[PDB]
Amino acid sequence: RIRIRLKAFDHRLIDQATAEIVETAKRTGAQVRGPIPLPTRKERFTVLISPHVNKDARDQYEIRTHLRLVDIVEPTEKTVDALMRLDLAAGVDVQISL
Template sequence: MTSKVRIRLWSTNIEHLNEVTTNLVDIAKKAGVRIKGPVPLPTKRLVVPLLRLPHGEGTKVYEKWEMRIHKRLVDIDADERVMRQIMRIRIPDDVYIEVELLR
């Protein structure tokens, strides 16, 4: 019996994220199941402005540190065999994954 699975992936490293999503898509295509995605969701930018001088005197010079969080969404109509293959994918430490069963 097939069930619909929604997989959310997010990472600060876009190369690792794209690698994992292509692995997911390849497994689904080889198994012949229906797949929707990967859908790129909006990138979240976290910006932290810091005063460059530690004592606060003189001209106000700021440094900006930025971290971008990239997200992808994949829907798969998967059976148990495909889900076992998906669970065996090697995922780097900086890629986070969330699996949700829809049906």
Template sequence: MLQLLKTLRLRQPARFASALSNTAAATLPGTEATPPAIVGEPDKLYSKLEIELRGIDPAVLKSYTWFATTAAEHLGIELGKCWSPRKAHHERMTLLKSVHIYKKHRVQYEIRTHFRYMNFHKLTGSTLDTFLEYIERNLPEGVALQASKTELQQIPEHLRQPPEQV
């Protein structure tokens, strides 16, 4: 058993070896293990997360919207408004068929970009980071995602007290 622990300590990085020794010390009678103090800043609060999706195929956007809203429900995130404009954004390019002459002979190419918008409300920083990473990793090909978040902050001290004279 002791040989197994030594090989584990040699194979594991230093942080796991120290955790292993802490747990071993905790099991010995007469010793008390103190849990490591979690020191850090408090979690941030966000009032709104706005997601804009752009893509060529509206069916893919609709399917991905369903995926993102289902993931939000599983994480307990409050869902806001999900909508898309009726018309797509058209970008047309007109080119000559011939390089030198025949100006009347032209070809038109068109790209249609469809948009979809989703809003999520009342998020914590850790939940927001987890949710964004999950939906970004599962983003389908041909879809662009842009996220903007609105953070809640405390009112500064100089604005909390009303002015003495107006």
């Protein structure tokens, strides 16, 4: 029911963000399912490398925007007032769908 959706820039930041999201709801008492993988988006950027003469040389960069879905099964009174506000994850864009 509480369809939490996380969006981060690093693989070792979002699994750790959803680790407390699973522990601070499972321990206090509720029904919780595990994290759904939700495929990572890879955005590529290819730009010319040399400033004034550049015919066939280019530099290639990319960003991997990771995603996660917790999807809390039952919205009990224990998890509603304890889940968020404690992770300090400033680099994770959380989104919640009911």
